[PDB]
Design a protein around this ligand. Structure first.
Ligand SMILES: OC[C@H]1O[C@@H](O[C@H]2[C@H](O[C@H]3[C@H](O[C@H]4[C@H](O[C@@H]5[C@@H](O)[C@H](O)[C@@H](CO)O[C@H]5O)O[C@H](CO)[C@@H](O)[C@@H]4O)O[C@H](CO)[C@@H](O)[C@@H]3O)O[C@H](CO)[C@@H](O)[C@@H]2O)[C@H](O)[C@@H](O)[C@@H]1O
Ligand SMILES: [Mg+2]
Length: 388
């Protein structure tokens, strides 16, 4: 009734729940945190919109902000965050702020950022002649194939078929804008088509697994390094340090390999107030509480997570820790996925087309024509909603 309901995701939800104890101690506001896996969170949010009942505070994946702003699910908090020492936009990376601001109105406060980088086994790269991480698409292909040639059930590089960012990241690296200046999808034009060919090359030549092997990060990257290279975010630094002691000093991260560029994705999460909340005041207090820079830095550093607030990167560990140095370097040019309200739907369509290619053996051009058409059809449906 007076309990503040907070919906949060994954491992970071534990830090939120723990920080919430002191908030309750200091205010007398009881907090209930529902911990939702990222794989289920989109559906949970759709259900909340359809029933107009949900939490008071919601942790929003950055890529879902356009969707849920457009759906009218997130409170416009522009006036409230403008007046705040700790939630004003000027504190946050411009890319992170782009995930919160639509048509001049602010719909959340950045909570953490992330970007994707290359994880690699330094010992195993050295053995196939790479003293440094692969720096180009050609090198990543070459190193991966040499690594897969260790033997039948040994690989070189992972492509996560459920990762929304992967095809879009590589596409931009090869000069695809993904949507052109007019908003027309261009997933069937040469830059993107060659991107998907390149990703499929690892599958077809046996250097990326073509099924889920069912190994944890420790078992695939650790030991003899069955999967000796992959792409992920800060959460994997923390996971590997905790779970793979056998490769201590035998792995590192590096910025992504380049094609025309090496741009990564900018993501993370924001805190937002659900528009139907009866406790908007207490929601805002919680957000402000959670935005205190020392409270933030404490859990961020402990988890190797990336702050969205700029001045946090002046902290000595963020400047000097090897993992943070690489994340900070990549963050410089990291861009959010297209900030469009059908993003998840489009990413899941990409996932199905990817599956058709890597598992079904579909032609990449034919499949990308099919995918692009699907995307244009979605966009036209939304257009028709805006034009009668
Ligand atoms: O897409 C919505 C939202 O996601 C935000 O990303 C979250 C991230 O979630 C991603 C999820 O990660 C789960 C992890 O999977 C591993 C991959 O991260 C890794 O790169 C890959 C290596 O090839 O191996 C996978 O196993 O598994 C953990 C359980 O063991 C989960 O705790 C973790 O959530 O991976 C999915 C695809 O496989 C992605 O769809 C999903 O987005 O989880 C992070 C940890 O909680 C979190 O820090 C991150 O913010 C993204 O930031 C945001 O911009 C998007 O809107
Ligand atoms: Mg092999």
């Amino acid at each position: 009734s007076k309990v503040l309901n907070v919906w949060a995701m994954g491992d970071e939800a534990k830090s939120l729940k723990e920080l919430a104890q002191k908030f309750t101690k200091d205010t007398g506001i009881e907090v209930k945190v529902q911990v939702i896996p990222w794989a289920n969170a989109h559906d949970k949010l759709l259900t909340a919109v359809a029933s107009k009942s949900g939490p008071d505070v919601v942790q929003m994946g950055t890529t879902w902000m356009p969707e849920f702003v457009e759906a009218g699910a997130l409170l416009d908090i522009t006036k409230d965050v403008e007046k705040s020492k700790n939630m004003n936009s000027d504190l946050f990376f411009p890319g992170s702020v782009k995930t919160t601001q639509f048509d001049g109105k602010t719909y959340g406060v950045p909570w953490y950022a992330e970007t994707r980088v290359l994880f690699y086994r330094t010992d195993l790269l050295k053995k196939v002649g790479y003293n440094e991480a692969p720096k180009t698409w050609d090198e990543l292909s070459d190193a991966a194939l040499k690594l897969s040639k260790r033997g039948k059930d040994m690989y070189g590089f992972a492509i996560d078929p459920n990762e929304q960012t992967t095809g879009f990241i590589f596409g931009r690296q090869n000069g695809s804008p993904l949507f052109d200046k007019d908003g027309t999808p261009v997933f069937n034009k040469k830059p993107f088509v060659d991107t998907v060919t390149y990703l499929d090359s690892f599958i077809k030549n046996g250097s990326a697994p073509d099924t889920d092997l069912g190994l944890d990060a420790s078992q695939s990257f650790g030991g003899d390094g069955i999967v000796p290279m992959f792409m992920s975010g800060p959460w994997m630094v923390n996971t590997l340090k905790d779970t793979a002691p056998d490769i201590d000093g035998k792995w590192a991260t590096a910025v992504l390999p380049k094609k025309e560029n090496n741009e990564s994705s900018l993501g993370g999460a924001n805190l937002s107030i659900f528009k139907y909340s009866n406790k908007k005041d207490d929601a805002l207090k919680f957000m402000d509480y959670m935005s205190q820079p020392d409270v933030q830095l404490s859990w961020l550093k402990d988890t190797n997570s990336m702050p969205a607030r700029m001045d946090a990167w002046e902290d000595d560990m963020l400047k000097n820790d090897p993992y943070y140095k690489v994340f900070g370097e990549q963050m410089k040019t990291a861009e959010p996925m297209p900030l469009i309200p059908q993003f998840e739907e489009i990413a899941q369509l990409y996932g199905k087309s990817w599956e058709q290619i890597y598992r079904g053996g579909a032609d990449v051009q034919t499949q990308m024509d099919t995918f692009n058409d699907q995307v244009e059809a979605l966009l036209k449906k939304l257009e028709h909603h805006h034009h009668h």
